[PDB]
Design a protein around this motif. Sequence first.
Motif, PDB file in Angstrom:
ATOM      1  N   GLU A  50       0.043  -7.542   0.219  1.00  0.00           N
ATOM      2  CA  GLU A  50      -1.107  -7.570   1.137  1.00  0.00           C
ATOM      3  C   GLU A  50      -2.448  -7.247   0.442  1.00  0.00           C
ATOM      4  N   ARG A  51      -2.421  -6.588  -0.724  1.00  0.00           N
ATOM      5  CA  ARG A  51      -3.568  -5.876  -1.313  1.00  0.00           C
ATOM      6  C   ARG A  51      -4.230  -6.576  -2.499  1.00  0.00           C
ATOM      7  N   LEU A  53      -6.442  -1.129   4.257  1.00  0.00           N
ATOM      8  CA  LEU A  53      -6.769  -2.539   4.467  1.00  0.00           C
ATOM      9  C   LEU A  53      -8.036  -2.761   5.323  1.00  0.00           C
ATOM     10  N   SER A  90       9.185   2.296   5.831  1.00  0.00           N
ATOM     11  CA  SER A  90      10.212   1.434   5.216  1.00  0.00           C
ATOM     12  C   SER A  90      11.618   1.595   5.808  1.00  0.00           C
ATOM     13  N   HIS A 150       6.526  -6.285  -0.174  1.00  0.00           N
ATOM     14  CA  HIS A 150       5.664  -6.956   0.790  1.00  0.00           C
ATOM     15  C   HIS A 150       4.342  -6.213   0.996  1.00  0.00           C
ATOM     16  N   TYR A 151       4.363  -4.892   1.196  1.00  0.00           N
ATOM     17  CA  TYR A 151       3.122  -4.139   1.367  1.00  0.00           C
ATOM     18  C   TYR A 151       2.206  -4.206   0.147  1.00  0.00           C
ATOM     19  N   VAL A 174      12.054  -4.371   9.843  1.00  0.00           N
ATOM     20  CA  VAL A 174      12.420  -3.289   8.926  1.00  0.00           C
ATOM     21  C   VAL A 174      13.640  -2.606   9.557  1.00  0.00           C
ATOM     22  N   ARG A 192       2.696   3.373   6.412  1.00  0.00           N
ATOM     23  CA  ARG A 192       3.435   2.260   5.761  1.00  0.00           C
ATOM     24  C   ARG A 192       4.969   2.484   5.709  1.00  0.00           C
ATOM     25  N   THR A 199      15.233  -0.306  -0.843  1.00  0.00           N
ATOM     26  CA  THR A 199      13.953  -0.362  -0.109  1.00  0.00           C
ATOM     27  C   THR A 199      12.970  -1.371  -0.703  1.00  0.00           C
ATOM     28  N   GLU A 257      10.642  -4.292   1.480  1.00  0.00           N
ATOM     29  CA  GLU A 257       9.533  -3.769   2.271  1.00  0.00           C
ATOM     30  C   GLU A 257       8.398  -3.274   1.371  1.00  0.00           C
ATOM     31  N   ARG A 306      12.798 -14.051   4.735  1.00  0.00           N
ATOM     32  CA  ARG A 306      12.406 -12.924   5.580  1.00  0.00           C
ATOM     33  C   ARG A 306      10.885 -12.803   5.769  1.00  0.00           C
ATOM     34  N   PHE A 307      10.124 -13.135   4.728  1.00  0.00           N
ATOM     35  CA  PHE A 307       8.653 -13.057   4.762  1.00  0.00           C
ATOM     36  C   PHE A 307       7.986 -14.404   4.423  1.00  0.00           C
ATOM     37  N   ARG A 335      -1.456  -1.689  12.883  1.00  0.00           N
ATOM     38  CA  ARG A 335      -0.111  -2.244  13.076  1.00  0.00           C
ATOM     39  C   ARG A 335       0.662  -1.649  14.274  1.00  0.00           C
TER      40      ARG A 335
END
Lengths: 442, 442, 442, 442
Positions: free
Chosen positions: A261-262, B93, B68, A257-258, B10, B66, A251, A254, A203-204, B38
């Motif tokens: 990013e960090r 970000l 979900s 994944h967020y 999502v 953000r 959940t 999702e 998926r990612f 986004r």
Amino acid sequence: EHVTGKWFSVPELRLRDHRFIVPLDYSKSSPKITVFAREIVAVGKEEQAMPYLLYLQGGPGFEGPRPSEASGWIQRACEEFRVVLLDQRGTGLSTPLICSSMLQFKSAKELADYLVHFRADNIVKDAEFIRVRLVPKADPWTILGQSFGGFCALTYLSFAPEGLKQVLITGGIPPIGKACTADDVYEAGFEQVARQNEKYYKRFPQDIEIVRELVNYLAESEGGGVPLPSGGILTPKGLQTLGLSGLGSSTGFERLHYMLERVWDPIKCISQFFLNAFESWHSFDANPLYALLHEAIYCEGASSGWSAHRLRDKYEYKFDAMKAVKESQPVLFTGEMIFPWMFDEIHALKPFKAAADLLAKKEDWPPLYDVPRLQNNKVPVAAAVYYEDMYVNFKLVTETASHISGIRLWVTNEFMHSGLRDAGRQIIDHLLGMINGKKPLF
Amino acid sequence: EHVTGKWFSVPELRLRDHRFIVPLDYSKSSPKITVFAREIVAVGKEEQAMPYLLYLQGGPGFEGPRPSEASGWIQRACEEFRVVLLDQRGTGLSTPLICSSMLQFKSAKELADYLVHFRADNIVKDAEFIRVRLVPKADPWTILGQSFGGFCALTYLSFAPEGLKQVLITGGIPPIGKACTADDVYEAGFEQVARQNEKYYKRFPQDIEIVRELVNYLAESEGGGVPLPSGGILTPKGLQTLGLSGLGSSTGFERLHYMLERVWDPIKCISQFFLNAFESWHSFDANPLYALLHEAIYCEGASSGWSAHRLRDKYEYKFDAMKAVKESQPVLFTGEMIFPWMFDEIHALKPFKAAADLLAKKEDWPPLYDVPRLQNNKVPVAAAVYYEDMYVNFKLVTETASHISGIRLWVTNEFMHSGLRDAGRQIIDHLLGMINGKKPLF
Amino acid sequence: EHVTGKWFSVPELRLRDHRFIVPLDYSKSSPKITVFAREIVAVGKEEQAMPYLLYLQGGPGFEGPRPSEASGWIQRACEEFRVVLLDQRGTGLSTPLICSSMLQFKSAKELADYLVHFRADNIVKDAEFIRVRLVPKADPWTILGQSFGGFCALTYLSFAPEGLKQVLITGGIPPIGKACTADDVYEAGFEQVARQNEKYYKRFPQDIEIVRELVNYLAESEGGGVPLPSGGILTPKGLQTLGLSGLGSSTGFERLHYMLERVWDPIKCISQFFLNAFESWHSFDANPLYALLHEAIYCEGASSGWSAHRLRDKYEYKFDAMKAVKESQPVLFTGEMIFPWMFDEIHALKPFKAAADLLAKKEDWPPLYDVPRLQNNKVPVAAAVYYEDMYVNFKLVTETASHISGIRLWVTNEFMHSGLRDAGRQIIDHLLGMINGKKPLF
Amino acid sequence: EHVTGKWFSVPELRLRDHRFIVPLDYSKSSPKITVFAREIVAVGKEEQAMPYLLYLQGGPGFEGPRPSEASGWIQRACEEFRVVLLDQRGTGLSTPLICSSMLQFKSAKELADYLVHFRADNIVKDAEFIRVRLVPKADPWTILGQSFGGFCALTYLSFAPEGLKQVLITGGIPPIGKACTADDVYEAGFEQVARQNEKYYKRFPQDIEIVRELVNYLAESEGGGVPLPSGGILTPKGLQTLGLSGLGSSTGFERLHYMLERVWDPIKCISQFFLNAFESWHSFDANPLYALLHEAIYCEGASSGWSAHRLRDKYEYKFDAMKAVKESQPVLFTGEMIFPWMFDEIHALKPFKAAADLLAKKEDWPPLYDVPRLQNNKVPVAAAVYYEDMYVNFKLVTETASHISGIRLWVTNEFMHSGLRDAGRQIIDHLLGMINGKKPLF
């Protein structure tokens, strides 16, 4: 003794609390313990006569739901019954372990000889002690169990089933009929966890680079890791437990994944936001009993020491992150399993190290179930069974459902294990529709 | 420079991210900063031409939504607009403040001279730098602003209004027309926070004993406080700030009540759960910029900083916790404001102490609003204004609404300030109904 | 005596009427008068035991609702209550003023000494006299008051509150605490009526020419007016009182605009249609008591010498029609007040001229409210308060709501004063939701 | 000559007006008349290309709908069509007759020779004169006709059918095929009016006393009976026409019953309110043309020889009020017919007395229908027909429906004649469902 509070209100609900004093251990007079429960009703119906419903919470050491608005399954239940959330012994208001006034248990043997009173059979004897006081004419009642609540419910069908009108279970049927089932559960768990990892990267696709570069940075770091603000240490073994909720939750994909990013600070070092998030990700600080008891719920006789730690070596060729980065393979996350090294990495677990081994060495646990009664049950039972579930294997559930006399069961791929919290409104209607006879047997 | 990601999914949504490189100071060629946004659309609707909408998230230093799942206002907006979610400069970000690689700024003077670039006027110049590249023919778009997003929107009506088709604001009209309004805002705030405390104790009458007993235990302890797990300190001044979100949010009263049940360790000490929960209650570790810039958004000239710390002396006869317990009065919690001592008590704020003083001493801030343009505006504007609001005073809003030529607004007592996140579905329908002309002027 | 009719039917309702014989004045034996009420219930529920509800009508001297289908608030109220609709003394079927036999009263002084019995406090004594006969065990009941019904309801909380279970008010909180509030009410009223005229011409820009041309034609006509079909006279003063219903009603602006299209007969003369419509616009032919009592409801003591007429001289610089046309300004409409000249212009008012003066000259009226009881009330109260209301000033209401001990209220902009008659279904649900406790105190 | 206004708004609608200049007689160059229509669309669809729809109004000389909110059939029609509402020649804003400067017709002969241009055939020639200018490419359009609009629609199928796409009719099929059908229509009408009176007294049994007493008081009074405020007279013949709308309307029975509660002033005299209500009950003051043309709509060549007055002599043994009270039988109301004496009793009709005779005496009226074309029609037609209808006899309708080639119709007992104004949402869906082919032929 039994004491009762004043009513108070929340949007569209009325709530009240009760407190009881109960033996630490039955067949002796003392020590005592205190246990807490909250009765919930719809706005107008405070004094009206209605059937009572008991909720059993989804883990070995978590507090009850603590609702803040009428929503989800509670809103549906409260139009028809009286929700009676109950904090299980050893958590919430029901006498948790002491701290700041530092532990009264002078040595690990004293703590180990205390914690063994918190198994599921005492939670049934406790629920009986409530019912006979709380229900107005000592009538039967109905129980709803999520996850570990289903493990409690089968001990309740085993011992003193006379209190039960009908039983509802979500995702919570245990495997039965052996001295210790833990090897069979984890042996299957490692096969399903591989699938969940494949669906994540499918998926990612871009994440494979992020996790591989992060594992190299952790591996090349001076201590073999990096220090957290709370004095723990992040290591590649620790990073592989990050998926424990992240691959099993409704959940989780999702949210995971967020977070990835960090990782890097802006222009190279790991970001303080990421360390703070990782330190905050899981609940061993607030609910330490969840780490202590996790192996023991599968034992009814001869034990096994650290069974998941024995099993992962069977799969080491795919689960070793430091092989995976050399072989250019994607690294795999893991979930719902506990390892000896975890008591060294995580700051909240540091003092429990000795007592955890004394429990891991204990033989001669008391029984939880008896198949010779379940084979001739007369109480109505309905169970929701999720097909692609990471936490309990479908093949073990579907063979165990053969031993219960009258169970009605439905299999679905539509929901993750969290599926009573999220979309719970339709689950309660579907399960009651089987027991109430509006959907008769095909 | 401009770069764009692959689409990903999502439940019921499609998402993509864009990244831009932008001047730090628009008076100069360099340094340069990176900014992130986004784009969100409904399922399969990726190629279709539609109007754009910009969302300004409106915590004074907070990250974007953000999402979900498709829920709340986003699920409505995607039926009609291509939504753009923007991480504001200096947060999320969009180039957050540097740490872990230890601070690049040589001294508090260097850091103070860096932070001054993060005001609302630069956020508008930045939002237009996106529009001209992202929108297909540089056409106008519509903006939605919660809280500080409304403060940004009035600077956007003041400077470069040519990009706006129509404007929607929730709870976010600032006071205007003076060199520094901060004294007047906090003077009004202390009148209202008293009321919110009265409604709390009226709903939960038994809490008055709990807070008084806890304040005595803290006040009698060695050094007048107790150490947090992360090396901060809890003191009666710290306990008074516990209500900052707990009185103003939609679920705040219920949340707060369930926390005060768990203060005492079972049989005397404060519980480890309460200290851990209090340490976790507010976000100054994740969002330090929200503590730094909070007073500056009211300044357009001579600042006279630490205004809230001056103003509480006018009310000290009711906000002094020690006078309250000695006079047997209920102790009062406090609203959204910051005091000098907070940089000493809270561990996350320790390094910012010197830089916060330089920002409080600065006295030549650039202007934000242009009243001689607002008084002859032609862009359509609709605003939701909450009546019993704690965070902005209704009296200052309702007189400021005189200075905008075309504005329509609805006063309501039905919602708390958080009322876009809860029940947001009907807010967007009601505000669009005014601008779209289905509810013509009474 | 007490007499009761047969049941009869309307689409989806069952109706019955009761008649009572009651003293003209209390603390004396005689004479008697007749009072009338109608009990209403849903189709199947004639004999079922349910709580009673009383409705109090909103204009002084106006007739009851007289329903002809199940619709609006009545349809909803009958889901829970047995509704009672009351014709107030001196109007409807409850002993209206005689005319057809002869103007019986011998002299204006006799008529004046009769009319003074028709104030709000006697209407509450009638409601008490009913309850104890009509309600099956003399239980408490709940009251609903639109407009002037709210003025009655506060006298009912002031005197004999033991009959009330809970109270609902829409747009009906009076100003209190002074001998005669009338000057303060009308002083605020002109500041609202100005803004209503601005919003009207902003919506229909072409009308400014129509009213100026029409005012010139009336002003140049012989005797400064034109004769009506019923022998009254139309004059520019008479034209300014179109706004009474036209600016206040939920459909007022639209209705008013369609009337001004038809002023001239086609090809110059005023149209017979317009004169016939203007003659039909006001209600003083059916409800003469509404013109007589209109200032008296504000006198708790002292007297008012035509306070509305005294006040317009302060604003005559803008409200003079001749100044407006000479200065090329838009002419302003007016509403919800009565002037001495109106008894000369309007044919239905001609005989009452002398009695209206005696009621204006009278002083030392009986008092209506009891603030030292309202300050320690225990009955639940809920009120809808409209923010932009032409009838009652919000700034007087919001301070008066301080004196009632336990009142809950919601401020809104979204409804005109008619909002219980028009789209009223949701109002009853929102007000009951506060009293019944489904929306607890924020 | 053609002119068009600015758009303006009403809740959920957009409106604009057009004005045309049209010949009085299409066989001549002069004189000329003004005709008015208003285009209506849903919000934001002002410029969108869509099918047009024309509405034709219910009675000769009545004004168009004049909407004040989106409701009823208009809300539904605007979902698919750009609606056009037409004020017919000689009424509303389309050049009505003129008073104020008296009457230009110095003689009844001039007025009689003028009024003959207002028949249904010229209304079709006006509609064609509009369509070719208003519809963007002179395409066909769809017509909706209520009551007298259905009489217009059959002339529009008889002459110039090329402009029609499809035709909808409610309660409006005329009888055809004879020189004057009026005798047959009024012969059938009394057979229905008798049954309506039976159902009224069956529902409200107590009213039989009230009407008998009131007839005796009128009959024993000096002269014809009692004077009205506007200088007319109330008489037992006048009372028999009170039921004209009262028996025919969808709400008429209830409104009539409430009015009969009010007949006496309190302590015996006829009440001032009842006289004022009766004077206001029907529209001959606002719509005088409705009284003048009413019999002529049935005539082709042959005379309109007061046929209703000739016919009641056949039934006078039951319709004579004085015989009814002497024989103790219930008195009967009447409706939808006009008599020679009515021009003496009703003050609004007084000046037309001579002109009404010259119309009644006329022969050589031009024809309206073309049966040799209707028998080979190709335009789709759908009709709603009501079984228990007082206006038009079902037996005459169902034989006339044989002469139309392709008509589909539905017969019901569910609606009174006014059904389109009340049930309009479902009526329009049902009729469009037949034409559009979603309910194919049984």
